[PDB]
Design a binder for this molecule. Structure first.
Ligand SMILES: Nc1nc2c(ncn2[C@@H]2O[C@H](COP(=O)(O)OP(=O)(O)NP(=O)(O)O)[C@@H](O)[C@H]2O)c(=O)[nH]1
Ligand SMILES: [Mg+2]
Length: 405
């Protein structure tokens, strides 16, 4: 259960990306406190409410994406907070697959590090169109000469990957000190404190720089599944962001990828954050109670679709850019028969690279068209971006060009 969800404002999905320990979770937490001084309808989430898992506590990092909710005077936001650690890139990718825009967090003390670059590249391949930058940990850097160096480094870095690097907002602040003040005074408002106010600059930048997306409520329901868990009284919940269409309680949906046959079943509840909806609309980040299906039967990577709207595919043609050694790519070329991982939206699957009659070997830097045959069926579509990863690095970026099987 919970209270019922009211549609006051337009809804935008944002989230935090950036290298490990630079301050994504501290900012996410500072965002819920800051806005809750202006709106009573924001539940505040503290640092330890976000990295709450026993593993996260054990490693002292974020491992799981967390979703939190805040809103400004202008819109409603779901916010996804991803991991920075390299071990956990596939979690950053499924969290970025749900973003309409990202907040890249870079630490002023350190500047751009290897997962600042990798996160920019992956967020693009997974459909993130806009990026706002939060330069964090400015309380640690007195030399304002450094601040301008990092700011420019980050702009060059974004320009490299086809973002508007020169126009992007770059807000400078300290998330930890804005968070401490909101603790000392929970009602702190705009104007009172310099640090809280840079969190307000960031929120102003989100509101105005990241536009409310054109969503298709008139095309058939497609929802990429991000997570499944069981609510112990209710049943099995598949969570994700609704790419397009609508769900109502009572609708049937097929569970489409990663298995032999698809499955139909009935939607039995829709929830956004704590609250109930009777209907879920393109753009919503929802929980979807599924009837008569255990959490061992729906999984991350499948999509829920209006029945008969989509057919999973196995074999496609693609145009691929293979990263150079200097972007974190692999060092030596690869051959026909190469078996990396492929990432489309929230799904990841093994594929075999099949080079054309007359291409012996692909090298770092090569743009190239090969065929890939995946070891499981997956909802694909032409022009769908994807990423290739193997051995713990991103080795490629590509677009699906023609579905063959
Ligand atoms: N000096 C200082 N420390 C900060 C600031 N913001 C965050 N930190 C500190 O930096 C450490 C990491 O913050 P954290 O939010 O957990 O980083 P992360 O980017 O979320 N983590 P991961 O990549 O594992 O997700 C914490 O000890 C936090 O207190 C800041 O403005 N100044
Ligand atoms: Mg974190």
């Amino acid at each position: 259960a919970k209270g019922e969800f009211i549609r006051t404002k337009p809804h935008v999905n944002v989230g935090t990306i950036g290298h490990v320990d630079h301050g994504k979770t501290t900012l996410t937490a500072a965002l819920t406190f800051v806005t809750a001084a202006e709106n009573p309808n924001v539940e505040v989430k503290d640092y330890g409410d976000i990295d709450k898992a026993p593993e996260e506590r054990a490693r002292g990092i974020t491992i799981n994406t967390a979703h939190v909710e805040y809103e400004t005077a202008k819109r409603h936001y779901s916010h996804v907070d991803c991991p920075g650690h390299a071990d956990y890139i596939k979690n950053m990718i499924t969290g970025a697959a749900q973003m309409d825009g990202a907040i890249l967090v870079v630490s002023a003390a350190d500047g751009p590090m290897p997962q600042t670059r990798e996160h920019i590249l992956l967020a693009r391949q997974v459909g993130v169109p806009y990026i706002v930058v939060f330069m964090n940990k400015v309380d640690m850097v007195d030399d304002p000469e450094l601040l301008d160096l990092v700011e420019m480094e980050v702009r060059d870095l974004l320009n490299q990957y086809e973002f508007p690097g020169d126009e992007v907002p770059v807000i400078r602040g300290s998330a930890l000190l804005a968070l401490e003040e909101m603790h000392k005074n929970p009602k702190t408002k705009r104007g009172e404190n310099e640090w809280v106010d840079k969190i307000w600059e960031l929120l102003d930048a989100i509101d105005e720089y990241i536009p409310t997306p054109v969503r298709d409520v008139d095309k058939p329901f497609l929802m990429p599944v991000e997570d499944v868990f069981t609510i112990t009284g209710r049943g099995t919940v598949a969570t994700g962001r609704i790419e397009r269409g609508k769900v109502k309680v009572g609708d049937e949906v097929e569970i489409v990828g990663l298995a032999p046959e698809t499955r139909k079943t009935v939607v039995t509840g829709v929830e956004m954050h704590r609250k109930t909806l009777q209907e879920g609309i393109a753009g919503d980040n929802v929980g979807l109670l599924l009837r008569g299906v255990s959490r061992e039967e729906v999984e991350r990577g499948q999509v829920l679709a209006k029945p008969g709207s989509i057919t999973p595919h196995t074999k496609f043609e693609a145009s691929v850019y293979v990263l150079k050694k200097e972007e974190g790519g692999r060092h030596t070329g690869f051959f026909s028969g190469y078996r990396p991982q492929f990432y489309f939206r929230t799904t990841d699957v093994t594929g075999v690279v099949r080079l054309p009659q007359g291409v012996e070997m692909v090298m770092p830097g090569d743009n190239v068209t090969f065929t890939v045959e995946l070891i499981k069926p997956v909802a694909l579509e032409e022009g769908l971006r994807f990423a290739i990863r193997e051995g713990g690095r991103t080795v490629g970026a590509g677009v699906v060009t023609k579905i063959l099987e």
